[PDB]
Enzyme design. Structure first.
Site, mmCIF file in Angstrom:
data_model
loop_
_atom_site.group_PDB
_atom_site.id
_atom_site.type_symbol
_atom_site.label_atom_id
_atom_site.label_comp_id
_atom_site.label_asym_id
_atom_site.label_seq_id
_atom_site.Cartn_x
_atom_site.Cartn_y
_atom_site.Cartn_z
ATOM 1 N N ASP A 197 -8.211 49.763 -37.489
ATOM 2 C CA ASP A 197 -7.250 48.961 -36.736
ATOM 3 C C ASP A 197 -7.098 47.555 -37.303
ATOM 4 O O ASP A 197 -8.087 46.926 -37.682
ATOM 5 C CB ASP A 197 -7.694 48.880 -35.266
ATOM 6 C CG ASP A 197 -6.854 47.921 -34.442
ATOM 7 O OD1 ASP A 197 -7.356 46.830 -34.099
ATOM 8 O OD2 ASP A 197 -5.699 48.254 -34.115
ATOM 9 N N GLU A 233 -4.490 50.522 -40.938
ATOM 10 C CA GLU A 233 -3.256 50.112 -40.303
ATOM 11 C C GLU A 233 -2.770 48.764 -40.813
ATOM 12 O O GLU A 233 -3.333 47.717 -40.467
ATOM 13 C CB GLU A 233 -3.413 50.044 -38.784
ATOM 14 C CG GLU A 233 -2.086 49.804 -38.074
ATOM 15 C CD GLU A 233 -2.128 48.671 -37.076
ATOM 16 O OE1 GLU A 233 -1.065 48.352 -36.511
ATOM 17 O OE2 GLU A 233 -3.211 48.093 -36.847
#
Ligand code: NPO
Ligand code: CA
Ligand code: CL
Length: 496
Positions: A197, A233
């Protein structure tokens, strides 16, 4: 880092957004397994802060307070059971690793957490970890606000607080070792990989220093000397300081240009047409195929103005959403991720949804279970896109044609498109507002095939449309612009 590590033959993963562990395990056994799905990306499994204003939003799971497997989705026991049960049916588990930060700097001190751990954001105290004030980048960030004021400066985006969240000093071995120990625990349990993330908000070299500390995959389910699947990401739609290529050395990267541009083509905005997809992939300016993780929409941009904006297709636009996911599952480019979500009450003021904070279906804070209806759909407001016939069967289409090259393209020069995957699968779309009638070269053997979009092949018969391909490989197709699902897909395993 680039290999999915899926059980041979499986080529896609599903994001079971906010699903509980007991529910995911059941789903692995009754559906994901037999239906041929490769894996499941789960929500952050570590402890987070409890946000009651607004009431338990989905985004509180992106504000860590410890690394204990204790959240609304379940506890450590249930997490281990789910990973074990899924692996035994051939479905892998990929974890959403929130490692760039801890909770918000302006959160109140106390035990308002999913597992009861104490934390004092203001003093930067996270005793459960433990972390202290010198484990954060407060002094490394040079902005007056302490947050990211300019995306054209790579230093503040990586060293400053993302939306007021406490930024971890990923350059220190203490932090690097702390995180690596958390991820390794996950690997020993049986996790196959991670979604890193907010990797855009971390230095590529720091991510690398954490990955180098990770063990090999659990030999109970993986071949010896297996490296975890890593997908980072990073949002890069172009024209910015940070680029996706900077992270190619760590593992795969989310290719956000994919859904942004596919959505625009399918919605027919800006003069785009489906016939322009002949060179879809790297020819459209995307990263290399073997480095990309593609998708139509993700948990963030489906409910707001994330990457892609208004052009992003979601389950709210079902008809076009299926067209898009179908094209993605048939095209050879990248490793595909399917979305599975929950419905919430949208309220648009000035074109923006102000109810995008709404969390998963719950009863006084506890997440409702996923009930299955007689027609294999879901109840309790879980939309289960992965359970829709068209998405499901295209997941199967992809496993069947894996490794086959792109072939026999065709288009009416507008929005009618068709293509095959070697001699094992052929798909045709009609996104024009008028009839489609053509005799196309399929590249498949002669015989009668069942269309997997309008039905299935049960026994020696089809429950939907049948397509007959002659000895030379040609076949007459007819698609009306009014049709419920304006596309047909047949393949080697739907043949009668
Ligand atoms: O990751 N998210 O989009 C978030 C996370 C935290 C926050 O307060 C707002 C948005
Ligand atoms: Ca950072
Ligand atoms: Cl993502």
């Amino acid at each position: 880092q680039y290999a999915p590590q899926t059980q041979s033959g499986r080529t896609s993963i599903v994001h079971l957004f906010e699903w509980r562990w007991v529910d995911i395990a059941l789903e692995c056994e009754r559906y994901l397994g037999p239906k041929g799905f490769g894996g499941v990306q789960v929500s952050p499994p570590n402890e987070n802060i409890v946000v009651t204003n607004p009431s338990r939003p989905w985004w509180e799971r992106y504000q860590p307070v410890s690394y204990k497997l204790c959240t609304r989705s379940g506890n450590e026991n249930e997490f281990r059971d789910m990973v074990t049960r899924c692996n035994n049916v051939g479905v892998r588990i990929y974890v959403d690793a929130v490692i760039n930060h801890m909770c918000g700097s302006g959160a109140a001190a106390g035990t308002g957490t999913t597992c009861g751990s104490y934390c004092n954001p203001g003093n930067r105290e996270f005793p459960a970890v433990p972390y202290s004030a010198w484990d954060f980048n407060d002094g490394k960030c040079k902005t007056a606000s302490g947050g990211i004021e300019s995306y054209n400066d790579p230093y503040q985006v990586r060293d400053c607080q993302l939306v007021g969240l406490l930024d971890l000093a990923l350059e220190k071995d203490y932090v690097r070792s702390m995180i690596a120990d958390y991820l390794n625990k996950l690997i020993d349990i049986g996790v196959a990989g991670f979604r890193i993330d907010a990797s855009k908000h971390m230095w590529p070299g720091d991510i690398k220093a954490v990955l180098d500390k990770l063990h090999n995959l659990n030999t109970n389910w993986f071949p010896a000397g297996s490296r975890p699947f890593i997908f980072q990401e990073v949002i890069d739609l172009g024209g910015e300081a940070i680029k996706s290529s900077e992270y190619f050395g760590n593992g795969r990267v989310t290719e956000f240009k994919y859904g942004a541009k596919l959505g625009t083509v399918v919605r027919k905005w800006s003069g785009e047409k489906m016939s322009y997809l002949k060179n879809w992939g790297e020819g459209w300016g995307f990263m290399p195929s073997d480095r990309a993780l593609v998708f139509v929409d993700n948990h963030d941009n489906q409910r707001g103005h994330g990457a892609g904006g208004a052009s992003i297709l979601t389950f709210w636009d079902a008809r076009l959403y299926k067209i898009a996911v179908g094209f993605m599952l048939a095209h050879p480019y990248g490793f595909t991720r399917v979305m599975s979500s929950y419905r919430w009450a949208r309220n648009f003021v000035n074109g923006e949804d102000v109810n995008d904070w709404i969390g998963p279906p719950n009863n006084n804070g506890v997440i409702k279970e996923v009930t299955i209806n007689a027609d294999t759909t879901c109840g309790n407001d879980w939309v289960c896109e992965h359970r829709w016939r068209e998405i499901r069967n295209m997941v199967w289409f992809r496993n069947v044609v894996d490794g086959e090259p792109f072939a026999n393209w065709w288009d009416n020069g507008s929005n009618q498109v068709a293509f095959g995957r070697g001699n094992r699968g052929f798909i045709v779309f009609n996104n024009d507002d008028w009839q489609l009638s053509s005799t196309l070269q399929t590249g498949l053997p002669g015989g009668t095939y069942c269309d997997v979009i309008s039905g299935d092949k049960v026994g020696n018969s089809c429950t939907g449309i049948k397509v007959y391909v002659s000895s030379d490989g040609t076949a007459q197709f007819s698609i009306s612009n009014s049709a419920e699902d304006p596309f047909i897909a047949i393949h080697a395993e739907s043949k009668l």
